[PDB]
Amino acid sequence: EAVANLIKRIEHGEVSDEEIRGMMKIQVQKRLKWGYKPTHEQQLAQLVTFAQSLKGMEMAEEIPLPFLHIMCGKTLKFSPGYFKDESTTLDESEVYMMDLYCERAQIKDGQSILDLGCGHGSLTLHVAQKYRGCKVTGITNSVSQKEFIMDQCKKLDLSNVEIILEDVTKFETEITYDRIFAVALIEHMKNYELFLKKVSTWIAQDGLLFVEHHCHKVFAYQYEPLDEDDWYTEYIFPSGTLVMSSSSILLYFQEDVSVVNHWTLSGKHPSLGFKQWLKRLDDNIDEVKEIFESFYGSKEKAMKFITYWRVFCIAHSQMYSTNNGEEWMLSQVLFKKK
Amino acid sequence: EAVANLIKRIEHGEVSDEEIRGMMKIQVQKRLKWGYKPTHEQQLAQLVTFAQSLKGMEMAEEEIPLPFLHIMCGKTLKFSPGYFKDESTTLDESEVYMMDLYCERAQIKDGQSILDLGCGHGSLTLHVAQKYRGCKVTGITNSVSQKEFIMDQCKKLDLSNVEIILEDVTKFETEITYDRIFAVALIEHMKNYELFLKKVSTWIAQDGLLFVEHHCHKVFAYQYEPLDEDDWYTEYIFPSGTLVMSSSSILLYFQEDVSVVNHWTLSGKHPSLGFKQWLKRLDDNIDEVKEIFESFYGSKEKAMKFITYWRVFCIAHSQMYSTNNGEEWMLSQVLFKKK
Ligand SMILES: Nc1ncnc2c1ncn2[C@@H]1O[C@H](CSCC[C@H](N)C(=O)O)[C@@H](O)[C@H]1O
Numbered sequence: 079e080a081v082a083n084l085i086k087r088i089e090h091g092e093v094s095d096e097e098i099r100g101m102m103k104i105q106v107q108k109r110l111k112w113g114y115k116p117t118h119e120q121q122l123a124q125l126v127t128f129a130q131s132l133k134g135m136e137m138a139e140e141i142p143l144p145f146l147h148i149m150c151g152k153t154l155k156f157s158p159g160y161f162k163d164e165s166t167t168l169d170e171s172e173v174y175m176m177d178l179y180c181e182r183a184q185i186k187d188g189q190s191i192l193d194l195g196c197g198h199g200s201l202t203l204h205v206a207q208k209y210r211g212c213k214v215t216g217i218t219n220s221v222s223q224k225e226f227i228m229d230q231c232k233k234l235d236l237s238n239v240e241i242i243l244e245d246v247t248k249f250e251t252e253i254t255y256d257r258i259f260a261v262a263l264i265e266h267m268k269n270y271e272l273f274l275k276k277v278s279t280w281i282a283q284d285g286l287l288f289v290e291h292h293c294h295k296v297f298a299y300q301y302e303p304l305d306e307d308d309w310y311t312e313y314i315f316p317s318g319t320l321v322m323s324s325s326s327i328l329l330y331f332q333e334d335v336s337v338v339n340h341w342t343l344s345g346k347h348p349s350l351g352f353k354q355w356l357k358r359l360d361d362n363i364d365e366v367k368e369i370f371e372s373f374y375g376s377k378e379k380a381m382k383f384i385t386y387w388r389v390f391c392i393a394h395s396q397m398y399s400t401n402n403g404e405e406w407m408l409s410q411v412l413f414k415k416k
Numbered sequence: 417e418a419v420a421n422l423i424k425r426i427e428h429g430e431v432s433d434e435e436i437r438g439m440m441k442i443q444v445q446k447r448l449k450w451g452y453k454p455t456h457e458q459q460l461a462q463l464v465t466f467a468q469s470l471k472g473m474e475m476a477e478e479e480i481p482l483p484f485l486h487i488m489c490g491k492t493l494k495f496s497p498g499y500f501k502d503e504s505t506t507l508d509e510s511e512v513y514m515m516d517l518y519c520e521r522a523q524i525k526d527g528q529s530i531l532d533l534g535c536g537h538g539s540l541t542l543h544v545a546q547k548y549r550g551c552k553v554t555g556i557t558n559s560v561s562q563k564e565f566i567m568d569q570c571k572k573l574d575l576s577n578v579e580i581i582l583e584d585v586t587k588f589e590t591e592i593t594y595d596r597i598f599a600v601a602l603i604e605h606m607k608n609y610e611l612f613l614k615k616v617s618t619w620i621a622q623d624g625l626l627f628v629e630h631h632c633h634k635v636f637a638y639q640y641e642p643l644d645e646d647d648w649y650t651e652y653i654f655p656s657g658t659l660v661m662s663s664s665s666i667l668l669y670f671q672e673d674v675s676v677v678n679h680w681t682l683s684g685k686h687p688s689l690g691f692k693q694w695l696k697r698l699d700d701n702i703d704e705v706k707e708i709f710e711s712f713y714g715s716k717e718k719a720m721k722f723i724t725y726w727r728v729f730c731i732a733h734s735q736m737y738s739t740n741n742g743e744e745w746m747l748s749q750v751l752f753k754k755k
Pocket residue numbers: 138154155156157194195196197198199200201217218219220244245246247260261262263266
């Protein structure tokens with residue numbers, strides 16, 4: 079009704095960025111009041127019941143490279159950076175975070191490395207160049223992502239990268255790997271039990287699996303609108319029904335792997351990154367328009383996608399900033415095979 | 417150290433119950449300030465670091481008159497919390513309510529083999545054996561007098577499905593496996609949960625389950641080390657060893673040999689009310705308690721030291737579990753399967 083009509087106003091510029099923030103603040107408080115319970119007994123039961131529900135699901139149920147070069151940092155990382163102090167640039171945050179992944183996943187030169195859902199190869203190429211004795215295998219289901227990475231290997235003279243074009247949920251191999259990364263991938267999964275069971279078979283003897291997931295600190299939820307006045311949910315997530323995990327949810331999925339270590343990082347880090355994405359978009363908006371008009375085939379369709387990404391950045395920067403980054407945040411889990 | 421004189425003053429009856437309660441409220445606020453951190457990153461790191469420290473430790477560190485337990489405890493001599501539906505619920509009712517809750521949550525069925533680790537005076541061992549005559553129930557305790565009490569109860573109650581093994585659980589070797597294992601208020605006596613759960617996991621039969629209940633803090637874990645030089649509680653209540661207060665989530669990090677099927681907590685109101693009932697029963701029978709302790713401990717002064725211990729124990733722990741409407745210290749129940 080108005081949920082369709084309010085959007086078009088935003089796309090015309092009738093809604094300022096601060097009004098967008100004010101709207102998402104309303105969305106945030108409704109989600110938080112929905113998720114929190116007055117007793118720990120109820121709060122825990124809500125989580126366990128949610129985790130059990132994922133076990134009755136399937137394991138799981140496009141963006142122009144020139145645009146990603148503008149919005150994302152130099153490594154095209156499609157996942158948060160680590161900000162030491164916001165003199166930290168977007169480019170610096172990508173490297174800081176990937177070195178943190180390497181430290182926490184206990185990467186050693188010479189190991190075989192598997193990067194599941196490698197995207198445009200930020201971590202695949204980071205590890206391959208930093209540890210030249212490693213063999214790094216990335217898996218992506220995107221032809222253009224694989225082609226970009228293989229082209230980077232040429233420009234960078236890398237001989238130790240292989241990219242496999244597959245659906246991770248259907249992939250099968252007899253090969254095992256010393257280290258497996260899944261950075262911002264379980265966000266696209268539903269039955270974590272089946273996902274971790276399959277991945278576990280790929281872990282070599284004494285190997286490790288490192289997972290980073292966006293989450294809320296306490297509770298988990300499917301992206302379903304909260305009431306009639308909720309537009310964010312189906313605007314940002316039009317199709318499918320994905321899951322926002324909680325920081326502790328993977329602790330309940332240790333049938334085939336066991337937790338070695340578990341960390342969280344404050345929502346400040348993803349918030350600062352989304353702010354940088356928006357700034358880069360805005361500072362180059364004319365070039366963004368030409369890229370999108372060429373790819374999407376018209377001015378109006380180009381500006382709908384531009385509005386999407388701006389709202390995406392503004393809304394998620396507000397969400398992750400909530401209460402000094404102590405609501406939505408990042409969870410990193412290190413697993414060994416079990 | 418004037419802490420000794422404080423202790424000797426409590427024993428001679430010059431420190432009121434309200435003073436003990438107030439002392440514990442101060443202790444509680446200190447422990448909470450110590451444990452809580454301003455960011456989840458720090459809070460979680462504190463818990464994971466603590467869990468990892470247990471993995472390098474020993475499984476555990478290397479006698480109460482029966483007539484006293486008959487007075488203080490409920491009818492089944494349960495040395496662990498009851499479940500209070502209302503505050504019409506009596507102590508005796510709370511024991512049965514809780515043991516029936518254990519049977520429900522551990523999915524107990526007639527005919528199963530049951531192992532009750534650290535069975536104490538047999539509240540749950542006897543509860544299950546009486547309820548399910550096709551079950552074979554084995555309890556393990558390291559106390560001769562506890563075993564003898566349970567076997568005497570088996571005579572009185574005409575039960576033939578109970579065996580009590582007299583053993584230290586941390587050194588116990590068996591190749592028997594069991595459909596259901598209980599560890600109720602036992603890991604409170606353990607340090608290396610990893611080593612403990614590894615050993616117990618070998619006793620779980622095919623498709624079997626292990627049910628653990630532990631007292632805990634909701635968020636953080638700690639060893640019973642004094643917080644400062646004014647802390648009397650820690651070393652008065654725990655005159656030996658470096659025992660551990662678990663957190664409600666800590667066993668989630670010990671799933672190498674067992675994996676979590678379900679996980680619940682219950683409010684600190686339940687243990688709080690139980691300790692209040694223990695104290696009331698002690699006080700309502702103080703003359704016999706003195707008679708029992710004067711005989712067992714010989715001197716009226718040593719008897720007073722031990723009466724005082726149990727009163728302070730009940731007062732302080734009732735206060736501790738009541739903190740913030742029962743939402744700080746509480747009970748955690750975890751159901752595990754093998755592998
Ligand atoms: N079943 C599947 N098989 C392969 N890739 C998948 C997948 N489901 C999702 N993905 C991909 O996984 C990625 C998650 S985004 C993160 C990409 C990369 N890890 C980084 O940090 O930059 C996306 O590129 C998405 O298209």
